[PDB]
Design a protein around this nucleic acid. Sequence first.
DNA 1: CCGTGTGTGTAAAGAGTGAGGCGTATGAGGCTGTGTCGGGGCAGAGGTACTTACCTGGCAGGG
DNA 2: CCTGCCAGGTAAGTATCTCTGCCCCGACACAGCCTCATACGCCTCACTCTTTACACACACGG
Lengths: 79, 222
Amino acid sequence: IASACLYIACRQEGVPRTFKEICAVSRISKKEIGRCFKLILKALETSVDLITTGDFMSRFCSNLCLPKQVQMAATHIAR
Amino acid sequence: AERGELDLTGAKQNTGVWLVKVPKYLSQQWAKASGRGEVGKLRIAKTQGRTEVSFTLNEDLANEHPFVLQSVGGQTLTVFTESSSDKLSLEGIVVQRAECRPAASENYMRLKRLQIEESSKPVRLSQQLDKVVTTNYKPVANHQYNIEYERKKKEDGKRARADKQHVLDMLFSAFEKHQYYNLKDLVDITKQPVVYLKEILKEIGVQNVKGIHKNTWELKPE
DNA sequence: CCGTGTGTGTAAAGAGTGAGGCGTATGAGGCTGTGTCGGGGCAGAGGTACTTACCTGGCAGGG
DNA sequence: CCTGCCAGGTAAGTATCTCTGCCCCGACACAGCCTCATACGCCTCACTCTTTACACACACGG
């Protein structure tokens, strides 16, 4: 539940983490996080905006050590 | 004559030996030679009222070591050896003490500086990283330790509910080895579901309260 | 002056690892259901300086 | 054969946790469709040092 809540909080704040990224920092597997994530949304009667390719470009490119120009190109290409 | 007895023939012979402390380089060179058969020659010069002791390093080994004697009246030093055959023996009694010192005054410190550098070579110290590490907590769908445990649980499978007669026969055979059994450990021997084991054990087995640790089950029907 | 005894080119095996793509298999997802069993909370026994006050040892008498 | 007050020492007191059963559960099989994601596996390809073969050459020596 905590792992799923952490995933939902990231989505609500506009900085989504992937289920795999949340699973890396949690002993709980991706499948169990995804299942609790669905239940928490139902229980809270809330929703999360759909993730877009641009929601991950800054973190993925910064972690890969890509310049800003390459990050902008990747953001445009995916969009 | 016994294993613990120490041979004293050397002492009875009044054998005299010299105790000498030597630097590391002299010993290291001798170790490097591995005992070829010779490492140098010791020269002793005695004058009308003085004595001079010095050691000369082998020319081959290199590719003067003056000796300073010390008074022995401060201690009684004797050498004893432990043979590989478990026969301790007393080699003799130390009759003179000496110390080996280098001849070089300043250039010797250069060797020490390297030696100190060699001694400090394995002294690890923190390293600075140009970039922040990005290889930690890499995204993963399931942890490797978790899939292995999941696979092991699936492969082993859930414990099955066997017939009462077989469990009873196995249950009592266990009681033979040990008078008292813990429920948690007893489950492993029976390899049966906890609820099923308790139900069968409840009919015949009884719980005895022990204040030392806790209440456990009794496999004796009475 | 013609024997023979050693060198040399260069792709041809000989292993010796190593790599890469592809194709098949797997999974995950609700769904719905049914036996079961480990499981996982679940609370539960059960084991710094000065001053004043109080206690103890001693020597003293008393009976 | 008992019984007790005072000095000295000590001492306070204030000021500046580890199991343990236990009910109320998840996740197993397994059904078709289905789309994309993840893993495995296997043979074909590469290559690279190190020999391996084989026609030819060339002193060499007396």
